[PDB]
Amino acid sequence: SLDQLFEEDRAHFMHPSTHAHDHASGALPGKIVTGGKGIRIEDHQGREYIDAFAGLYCVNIGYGRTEVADAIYEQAKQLAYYHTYVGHSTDAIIELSSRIIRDWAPAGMKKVYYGMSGSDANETQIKIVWYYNNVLGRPNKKKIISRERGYHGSGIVTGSLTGLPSFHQHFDLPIDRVKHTVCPHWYKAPAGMSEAQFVAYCVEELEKLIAREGADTIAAFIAEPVMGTGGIIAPPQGYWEAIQAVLRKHDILLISDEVVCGFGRLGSKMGAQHYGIKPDLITVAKGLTSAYAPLSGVIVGEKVWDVIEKGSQEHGPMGHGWTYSGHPICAAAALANLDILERENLTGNAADVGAYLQQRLHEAFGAHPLVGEVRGVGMLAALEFMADKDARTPFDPALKVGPKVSAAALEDGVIARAMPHGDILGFAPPLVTTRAEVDEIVGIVKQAVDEVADEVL
């Protein structure tokens, strides 16, 4: 019975990112998702939705892939689990590691360590960074630089890396070793700065932070190539070249957080290849399995890996492991997911349909009175709604313009997320999305945007 399921839900299920009281009282209504196929999901009332967010930037090959279900099933039958401690493996996790390195990761990458979430992967990253510096005899070189509006997970250390205040409030974050530099969002740059000047500004602010803290105290810089949960914010022209030069100069490791950008999302293998980023370490999750099973990766470069090997020679085995590191069913899901990405050339589809997505959104919304900025890269896009387009004056947050546009689209059967800490409607459709489906999506969103504009303008 549905009523009983919702009652049990309210009574006993603690959801992620859900108003605890309102959910439990029934004021925030529950929804049960019962199925999905391609880019469409179905709920408990039999309503069907076009999921223009692919879950949470993650159902990249689309819904209802029996090919992935079968691969999971065959592994679960043969050997659902053994540990990978003390050199133990399955054939699946070995094959996945070689495939990730050979076919998806940028040059200079060597090893992969496995977890289950982007959050646990970035936890592993910080442990590796501190280990690296300790074994090199640099005990002070431990601080991590992140960026405002960055998203790097929902833990204590990883939530500190995150630069969005909802992940800090009442959790005593950020910890002292995590510092944040500027959100490289050209649209909101100081008034009348060219793109080039804004990049110079970003560089100078990073230099200033490094001078305040001491380069000798800073171990790493973590960043998403394009910021996801922070609002689909692409880097300015020249940003990655300029930032990389600063980091090289001060001997600061670069972590590319590819949890959203990885595995074809931008129309390249990862954001790193897309922007010519040469990181020392890389975090992956989401599109690694298209969410068919939970799996995360830390991709270790040659430079860091050699220090890890030397660390082991001097100090014995590194004290790091998760019970389910390398989980066989999750590895199997990943392998089938990569087969599909490769066989259907979804990276190429993401480039083609992604450019179509950008073009259509600019046509529909580039002159719309509600829309301050249309932005995106490959198969990520967003509309940011603003009260004064020219002066870049936001709406009063209490007005909930982003959530309102999202809720209106949802009434008409499109899921596009109201992004946090702003009035931003985000798009992250499956990489199998067609040009026709883009038009259908944009059409429904157009009506949603007009409707809210009628209310608030």
Ligand X SMILES: Cc1ncc(COP(=O)(O)O)c(C=O)c1O
Contact footprint for ligand X (CB under 6 A): 117-119, 122, 151-154, 224, 228-229, 257, 259-260, 285, 322-324
* Cβ within 8 Å of residue 160, ≥6 positions away: 146, 168, 173, 174, 175, 178
Binding partner of 97, given ligand X, a copy of itself, none, CB within 5-8 angstroms per partner class: a copy of itself
Binding partner of 152, given ligand X, a copy of itself, none, CB within 5-8 angstroms per partner class: ligand X
Output 99 or 389, the one with its CB closest to a copy of itself: 99
Which residues, in sequence order, are bridge partners of residue 179? 145
Scan residues 360-419 and list those touching a copy of itself (CB under 8 A): none
Does residue 140 touch a copy of itself according to CB under 8 A? no
Binding partner of 257, given ligand X, a copy of itself, none, CB within 5-8 angstroms per partner class: ligand X
Q: What's the min distance (Å) between Cβ of 363 and a copy of itself?
A: 30
- Which positions from 109 to 138 touch a copy of itself by CB under 8 A, shown as an x/- string? -xxxx-xxxxxx--x--xx--xx--xx---
Give the total of residues touching a copy of itself (CB under 8 A). 126
Output 2 or 245, the one with its CB closest to a copy of itself: 2
Does residue 168 touch a copy of itself according to CB under 8 A? yes
Output 206 or 270, the one with its CB closest to a copy of itself: 270
Pick from 27, 30, 49: nearest CA to 38 = 49
Element (DSSP H or E) covering residue 40: strand 40-43
Output 210 or 334, the one with its CB closest to ligand X: 334
Output 24 or 456, the one with its CB closest to a copy of itself: 24
Task: Check: CB of residue 284 under 8 Å from CB of residue 121.
Answer: yes
Ramachandran area for residue 175 (φ above 0: left; ψ -120 to 50: alpha; else beta): beta
Q: Of residues 231, 264, 267, 294, which one binds a copy of itself by CB under 8 A?
A: 294
Rg (CA), the chain: 22
* Cβ within 8 Å of residue 242, ≥6 positions away: 199, 200, 202, 203
Output 125 or 433, the one with its CB closest to ligand X: 125
Q: Which two tokens stand for residue 216?
A: 């000798």
Q: What's the min distance (Å) between Cβ of 113 and ligand X?
A: 13
CA distance 56 to 323: 26
Output 14 or 191, the one with its CB closest to a copy of itself: 14
CA distance 448 to 457: 14
Binding partner of 330, given ligand X, a copy of itself, none, CB within 5-8 angstroms per partner class: a copy of itself
Does residue 172 touch a copy of itself according to CB under 8 A? yes
Output 53 or 356, the one with its CB closest to ligand X: 53
Does residue 263 touch a copy of itself according to CB under 8 A? no
Q: Of residues 238, 321, 394, 443, which one binds a copy of itself by CB under 8 A?
A: 321
Q: Indicate if the alpha-carbon torsion angle 297, 157, 214, 245 is positive or negative.
A: positive
Does residue 85 touch a copy of itself according to CB under 8 A? yes
Q: Indicate if the alpha-carbon torsion angle 282, 286, 292, 295 is positive or negative.
A: positive
* CA atoms lying within 13 Å on the CB side of residue 188: 17
Q: Which two tokens stand for residue 127?
A: 């442990």
Crossing angle between the packed helical segments 302-315 and 118-135, to the nearest 10 degrees = 60
Element (DSSP H or E) covering residue 178: strand 178-181
